[PDB]
Amino acid sequence: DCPDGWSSTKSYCYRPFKEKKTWEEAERFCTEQEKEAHLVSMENRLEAVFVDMVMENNFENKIYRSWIGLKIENKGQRSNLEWSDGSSISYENLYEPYMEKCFLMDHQSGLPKWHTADCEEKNVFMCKFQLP
Amino acid sequence: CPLHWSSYNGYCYRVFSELKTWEDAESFCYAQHKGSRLASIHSREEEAFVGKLASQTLKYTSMWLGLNNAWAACKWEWSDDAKLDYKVWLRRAYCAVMVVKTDRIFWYNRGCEKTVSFLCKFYS
Amino acid sequence: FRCPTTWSASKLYCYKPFKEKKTWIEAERFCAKQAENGHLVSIGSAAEADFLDLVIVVNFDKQRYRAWTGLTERNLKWTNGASVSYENLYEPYIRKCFVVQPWEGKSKWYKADCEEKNAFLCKFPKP
Amino acid sequence: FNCLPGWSAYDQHCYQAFNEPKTWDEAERFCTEQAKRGHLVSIGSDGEADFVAQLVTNNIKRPELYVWIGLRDRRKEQQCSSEWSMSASIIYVNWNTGESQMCQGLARWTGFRKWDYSDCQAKNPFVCKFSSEC
Question: Which Cys residues form disulphide pairs (chain A)?
């Protein structure tokens, strides 16, 4: 079962927070619990609706801008790039500047949208994990 | 922001013509205002913003940058940093800068012990 | 082991461009027909990079080439594990297929729709 | 105290050179997957640098050989290697040079081994380095 405060839908627990933190600190916060996991994750169009309720109903339905489990980047060994030959990435040369995006869930009405935002921003978030 | 200084939304930016080392460049800004440190660029919308400031203040482009490149090593894969070495030596530890390249602005490598212009940046 | 006619060689791999405009999807599988492990060009380091440029200028000239390379984007694997099976971004994410064009002296890789037909490069080991 | 069977030591640090030459990642991520929890060999002292050179040669027949000293340093990713004057974590940079990822090494030409940098996808043997809590 989910701890005190954490909700559930079938086998997953959800519970957001008010303490505004950056993306890193957020992803580095949830991981530091009894059950090592990550931030919120919307895999299907069915969960995105559930995470919306336990987010507003608990946050006074106030227009939030919570973070998410997305972090795309074209740098290092964590870059969203791969080669056909299967060779790893040890050298690059892209015209575009080395970025670091950290999307979020900007809610306005009904279902919250997904928009890019500076990783160095202060907003709310939500954790998530799967029971054993 | 004060006079001669620019403004984005929460931080102020300015350009200095007087060329100075990279060291006194960090100590200089540190004086101006509170939390005043070398100009930083952690966003495209932030880079294109400075690309216009250093274009009206000066004709060319030759100034430092708060970026700290250089070889060295924050710490070996293990824990202890790179105290003693024994490489063949072939130019590595340098400090980034910024010069025009038939477009926006790109940062290049330059001696940290050189004398070139720079910038200052402080929060509101 | 030496590379076939009209095929460059470094020490372990072979290189050769193709003017015939073809999409990345089909150009990526054409090399596989050339020889074993025939995959599109894949720059390893700086040395291997400056090497390829020495051929992209001799086979094209005029200085205005635009070939494709074996470099694409993943499916954005979440922190937990499952990929992005659900996309609701303000702007649909499309796995763009990079290319290569001349930019004074050296070269640079830009982003282009994986549907445009242009030139491409092949490569494969000698052993 | 007392390293594992087949692991030479000096005071508290244990060493051991394998006979299987992998790439770079495999080498580093290999030592960690052992008894004690340590990484590749690290040279943080002159009186310990050549110490490994002799240990290795004493097992690799003493000829020429390149070893990975576990030194990975590039110019991208949040792998540090570069920070700002305001502790601003790296999240946006526009370098001019190539986006390479050099991986140092350890070549033993004649005498004290050198620290030559070669390709990461290279295949050369190596040696680990662990320690014990006190």
Answer: 2-13, 30-127, 102-119
Q: What is the resolution of this structure in A?
A: 3.2
* Cβ contact B101–D96 (<8 Å): yes
- CB pairs C-D closer than 8 Å: 7
Provide the experimental method for this PDB entry.
X-ray
The topology (CATH level 3) of A1-132 is Mannose-Binding Protein A; Chain A (3.10.100)
Structural domains of chain B ordered from first start: 1-124 (3.10.100.10)
Q: Which single residue is written with the structure tokens 């943080």?
A: D44
Cβ–Cβ gap D100/A90 under 8 Å = yes
**What is the CATH code for C1-127?**
3.10.100.10
Chain A residues 62-81 with CB within 8 Å of chain D = 73, 75-79
Of D92, D100, D101, the CB nearest to A98: D92
Cβ contact (<8 Å) for A90 and D101? yes
Domain containing residue D48: CATH number: 3.10.100.10
Strands C39-40, C67-68: pairing is: unpaired
Residue D99 phi, psi (nearest 5): -80, 55
Q: How far apart are CA B44 and CA B53, in angstroms?
A: 15
Nearest to D69 by CA among D85, D56, D87, D78: D56
Task: State the chains in contact with B (3 or more Cβ–Cβ pairs under 8 Å).
Answer: A, D
Closest CA to D20 of D9, D10, D36, D31: D31
Q: What is the largest CA-CA distance in chain B?
A: 51
Domain ranges across chain C: 1-127
Q: Exposed e or buried b for every residue in C37-61, given b needs 16+ CB within 10 A?
A: ebbbbbbbbbebbebbeebbeebbe
Q: Which helix (H) or strand (E) element contains residue C52? A: helix C46-56
Residues 92-121 of D with CB under 8 A from B: 92-97, 104, 112-117
d(CA D13, CA A97): 43
